[PDB]
What does this fold into?
Amino acid sequence: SYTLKDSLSGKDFLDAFSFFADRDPTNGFVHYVSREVAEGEGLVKVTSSGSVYLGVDHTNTLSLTDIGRKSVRLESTDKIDHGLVIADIKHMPGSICGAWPAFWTVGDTWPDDGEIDIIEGVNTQSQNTMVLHTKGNCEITSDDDQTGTTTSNQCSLDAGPAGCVVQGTPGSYGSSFNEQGGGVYAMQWTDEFIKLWFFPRSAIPKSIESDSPDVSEFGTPMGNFKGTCDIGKEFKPQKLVFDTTFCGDWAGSVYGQSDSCPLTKEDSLASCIDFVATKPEEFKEAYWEINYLKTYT
It folds into this structure.
């Protein structure tokens, strides 16, 4: 079994992350700001229930040639290397045109060392998309010990840009996740596999609640990244990252397709920027509320 490594909530949680404040690597219409700026403008706070709020500017109307809408990107100071990660999340950014939230892991370079995307989606998406990108040839083949649905089975960067993608079940992302009070996302990382689970609020395994996790009671993973390579050996120690960007590489390119998002400008990216710049009130729900983050070895 597993020993508790870090237990992070409230101010201690915030103190355990650095705030990335440079131009978005994913080219989003976002203005990532430092912690003191975020706290001053209400983007970051500890709530009265003890959770951590990470939100965006939902007040100001912006120029189309502004850097972007203000947000934050937190990267853990300490790295994780195998073991368990348990994130109890009350709220994540909603199913909102332009939005691109992510809970993910990254090494010292990006994107070419690969990454583990635990929670990720764009625009008005309603179900989570779990994604791995690996350096090595890795085909995931465990679609029959997994509740999610594999939509792309090759993880390697060399094989293509999509990576290996598993779609989560209803209620696992965005507005649907929020209205049921979120839940817990869990990752188990071993040499052979990375397994991801989502446990809806009021349906969280008791061993997680007791800080003595028994993976046997987790049941079937939602995403089972296991197959033709030792998946977990594809990654060096990783930083954990929470962010919300806007538009950019993914959200901006698919904006307006089957998502009810309005096309107002010369292409989808420009239309995305128009929405994000001119509709600040639509982003009131584009926030994370994180109860805790616990890691185990």
